[PDB]
Design a protein around this ligand. Structure first.
Ligand SMILES: [Mg+2]
Ligand SMILES: [Mg+2]
Lengths: 44, 119, 112, 56
RNA sequence: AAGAUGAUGAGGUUAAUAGGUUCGAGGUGGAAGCAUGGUGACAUGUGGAGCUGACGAAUACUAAUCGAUCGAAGACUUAAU
RNA sequence: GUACGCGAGCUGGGUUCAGAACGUCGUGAGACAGUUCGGUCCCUAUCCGUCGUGGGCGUAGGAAAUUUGAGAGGAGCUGUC
RNA sequence: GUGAGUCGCGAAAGACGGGUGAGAAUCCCGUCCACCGAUUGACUAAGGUUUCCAGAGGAAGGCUCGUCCGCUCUGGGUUAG
RNA sequence: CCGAUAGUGAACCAGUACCGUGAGGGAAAGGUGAAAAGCACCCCGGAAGGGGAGUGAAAUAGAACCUGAAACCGUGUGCUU
RNA sequence: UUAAGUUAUUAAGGGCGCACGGUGGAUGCCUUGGCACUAGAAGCCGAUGAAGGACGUUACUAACGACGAUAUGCUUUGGGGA
């Protein structure tokens, strides 16, 4: 087998990273929930 | 006949134990292996009383190609020692010196241990 | 008179210890030292320490002698239970119990 | 495969009338003044199986 | 000689219980070295040679040491001497 | 006869999964009155039962031997000349 | 708790000696032995993030023990025209 | 109105540890005594732990520290098998 | 001494009861936080750079708070009295 999640940075500091989120409407809303809810981390 | 292990590994284990016991004249072991190496080494002290070339060509098989020894900063080989020294103590006696001492058991494996010697 | 001594949170189950105790209960001290001190197990060191420790405190504090000292009662009781878990097949687990103990010895002479 | 029933506090105990362990052989030393086990060595002082023949 | 373990059995120095040694059976099938004949590979003699787990007698040289535990002092009633 | 005996002892060839195909019925998805190539069989035995085998106590004192045998099991076939 | 001190203890060739220590089949040292060798070797990328090294410690972790570790405690280590 | 399985999910270092690639989902865990006066000192022990001596009204209140039930596990014993 | 008859003693272990502990944490009591509400105010912040966060700052310093290279805080103006 090779299981899912053969990991990497660039595809993870891309897509789920910030500047994608804060370069898109929906993502800005997402961040609004992860702030309103309180969290020690974003983009992860 | 008796089995500690597989065929080969047993044999080499016995060339090893019997290679020792002469380098050191006594060791501490589990009882079973002491019984078997007793039989062997008994046969080798029966051999080293004769002292022919062929006898060396029979002690060669079991004992090892060399294992260096120094008593007095001397060079020996566990073969020179045998036919040159050991039997020359027990000529007046038969072979069949070796004795066993049921020393005690062992915390780890519960195995009985002993002290087999030829002294 | 009376006398005792304790060991706590010892990292052994009760049972394995309890057998060893059933080789003790009733005897005289010297014998029981020997009995423990020979059998090839993991509890024998411990019980040996605790027993002779008890004779120590009896001697220093209470000023007894050693002939008549006998083992009136002895018993080990259950202790905290460090739950762990070993993985196992098919995506599951199984919770091991790393057990403990509280050993209790009460040496006695029987007299005043 | 499995038990169907709960093994009660009696049978769990009657089953354990045989996990006891035997009183090991013992005897005093001939000139080491203490107990040890039979057809074996003392572990003390100088070894005494018939008297000293060892150090350990 | 019985054996999963426990049991059964042979035995425990006032002894042949097992090992070893010395003999022997059987088995394998002509050891090594040496010489000789060979350019050598190899053969012949020394030699039914040497070797040998379990089988068979003898041989106390070694190992079963010194030791502790358990176990009775025989209820009554009749009917007998 | 004993779940047309027995799968917590075995197989798994047909048949009762998914694929595909032939005749057919259906406007059609698909289905047989059928046929055909292939296709995952887990269970570390608690109790009872059964096969063997050891402890404890009893059999009015304690031991070693021998042995009776109420009962139970087993064997029970048959041709040619 | 029961199951159960029962199944399992995650392919594998180790043995001996000498040290240490309160205590060693498992720790250090050596000698022998065995194993791979288009590799169980050597070098880097992705990746993980201090696991690296020294000195101490062994409460739990390590599928056993452990005087040891990739676990803890203290300290310290990564250099580019 | 609740008074720690209730009540904010959250009384305590919680939207934490953790799980998941990610959106996201989501925990358990209060109480020594009046005051820290938090066990000087001896003894066994390698330590841990303990017996003693003392602080305190009480240390079976001694840090996993108010109260401490039931399951569960033991030790001994009157009766019994 | 004989025959016959009867019968208890055993507890390796177990059950009933009685006690003493151990385990683990319910109940009791309390609150270090919260729920729902009344009156009243207030109902925005930001390119003169927010909200929210990263990295740092202490004599020794891991974390929360507090603060921001003038850094575990500066000056002033009042208040307060070791
Ligand atoms: Mg060693
Ligand atoms: Mg409560």
């Amino acid at each position: 087998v090779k299981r899912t999640y053969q990991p990497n940075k660039r595809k993870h500091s891309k897509v789920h990273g910030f500047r994608k989120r804060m370069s898109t409407k929906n993502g800005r809303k997402v961040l609004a929930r992860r702030r309103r809810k309180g969290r020690k981390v974003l983009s992860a | 006949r008796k089995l500690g292990r597989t065929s080969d590994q047993r044999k080499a284990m016995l060339r090893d134990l019997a290679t020792s016991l002469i380098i050191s004249e006594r060791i501490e072991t589990t009882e079973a292996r002491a019984k078997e190496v007793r039989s062997v080494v008994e046969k080798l002290i029966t051999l080293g009383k004769k002292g022919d070339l062929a006898s060396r060509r029979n002690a060669a098989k079991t004992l090892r190609n060399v294992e260096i020894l120094n008593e007095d900063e001397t060079t020996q080989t566990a073969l020179q020692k045998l036919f040159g020294e050991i039997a020359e103590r027990y000529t007046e006696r038969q072979g069949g010196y070796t004795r066993i001492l049921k020393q005690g058991p062992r915390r780890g494996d519960g195995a009985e241990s002993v002290i087999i010697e030829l002294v | 008179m009376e006398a005792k001594a304790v060991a706590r949170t010892i990292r052994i189950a009760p049972r394995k210890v309890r057998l060893v105790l059933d080789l003790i209960r009733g005897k005289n001290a010297a014998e029981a030292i020997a009995i423990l001190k020979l059998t090839n197990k993991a509890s024998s060191p411990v019980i040996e320490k605790v027993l002779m420790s008890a004779l120590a405190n009896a001697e220093h504090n209470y000023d007894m002698n050693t002939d008549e000292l006998v083992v009136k009662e002895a018993y080990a009781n259950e202790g905290p239970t460090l739950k762990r878990f070993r993985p196992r097949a098919q995506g599951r687990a199984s919770a091991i119990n790393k057990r403990t103990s509280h050993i209790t010895i009460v040496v006695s002479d029987g007299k005043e | 495969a499995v038990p169907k029933r709960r093994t009660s506090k009696t049978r769990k105990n009657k089953r354990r009338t045989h996990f006891k362990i035997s009183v090991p052989g013992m005897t005093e030393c001939p000139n080491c003044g203490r107990e040890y086990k039979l057809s074996h060595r003392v572990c003390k002082n100088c070894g005494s199986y018939n008297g000293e023949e060892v150090a350990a």
